[PDB]
Amino acid sequence: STGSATTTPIDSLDDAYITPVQIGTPAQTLNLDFDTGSSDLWVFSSETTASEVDGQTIYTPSKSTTAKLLSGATWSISYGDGSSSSGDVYTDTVSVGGLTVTGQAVESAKKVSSSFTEDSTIDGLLGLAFSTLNTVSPTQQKTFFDNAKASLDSPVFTADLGYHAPGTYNFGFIDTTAYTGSITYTAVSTKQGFWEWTSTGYAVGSGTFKSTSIDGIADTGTTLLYLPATVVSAYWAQVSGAKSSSSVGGYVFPCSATLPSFTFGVGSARIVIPGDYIDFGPISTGSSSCFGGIQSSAGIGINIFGDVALKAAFVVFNGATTPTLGFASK
């Protein structure tokens, strides 16, 4: 089997991407944030505290003939941005782009933090990291990908995120028309439960490539590119007037600037992030200070190849017995 679904930016900045997901019978379609950095499929629901729902579409398990309470199971998750959610668990039928999993754990939110309430466009998350990170207790549950894997034509999914435009998540096949040149594959460590890999270096603009190992995670659920302070300083040093602002929470730059590109290495291959992808706009409405899309990972504890980086590539998440990651230009 295979599946193919379009993923759409939630706003003009590409702050996140939503993908429609069918849950239950008859189908209830929710727009979920596909997150390769976590491993829970959770939704706003009829059980979510009413004051914490503000415009989201909810899953109502009592209206699904295939929903079953997973007795005794609870979940609770906290994300790198400080947001969180928790609740109980149903199993139900879940389909993405024509690919159907029966008995998928659908984690129903009883509580969500303010960041989730305040974002009307995201109805929940669909985790695509390794199932070892799944938070369901006392019996850990499998991700949608893990459940689908054996049935897929090939045990892979691909992320093709757009810049200010829709893109695609495919399951079970590699669309050879979706990228240019060749896909370069690179080793993955699953020891922390992430799609963790080592970039071979970077360049800023038309500058020379610096060969240096940068361990990090491919994370579709993180907006920005978080890299070591040395790397980030070298980037922003090429933008007149750019500075790290403790008050704003990162590097800012004059909105009048033209940003240089940023290149990262995948083996001997190179992925080029155009400068415009690094512009996240005014820090506040009407400001001439703009927020940068490359930020320091110092104090996160890990480097994160988030959407800023991934949307410059066609990315293969290869879930073979020994997982790997592939990157192509597009």
How is the chain split into domains, by residue range?
5-174, 175-330
- How far lies 150's CA from each of 2, 72, 153, 166, in Å? 11, 28, 8, 28
- 199 close to 214: Cβ distance less than 8 angstroms: yes
Residue carrying the six token digits 């090429």 = 238
**Is residue 177 classed exposed, middle or buried when 0-12, 13-18 and 19+ CB atoms within 10 A define those classes?**
exposed
Q: Please give the distance of CA 69 from its chain centroid, rounded to a whole number.
A: 28
Instruction: Give one word for 323, left, alpha or beta, with left for phi > 0 and alpha for psi -120 to 50.
Output: beta
Fold classification of 175-330 is Cathepsin D, subunit A; domain 1 (2.40.70)
Cα–Cα distance, 143 to 38 (Å, whole number): 9
The secondary element (H helix, E strand) that includes residue 236 is helix 229-236
Same fold, 5-174 and 175-330: yes
Domain 5-174 classified CATH 3.40.50.300?
Answer: no
Give the largest Cα separation in the chain, rounded: 60
Question: Determination method here?
Answer: X-ray
Residues annotated as part of the active site: 35, 199
Length of the chain: 330
Q: Within 13 Å, how many C-alpha atoms sit on residue 130's CB side?
A: 19
User: What tokens were used for 113?
Assistant: 């933090």
Tokens found for residue 293: 């899309």
What backbone phi and psi angles, to 5 degrees, belong to 52?
-105, 5
Peptide bond preceding 26 in cis form (omega within 30 of 0): yes
CA distance 248 to 228: 19
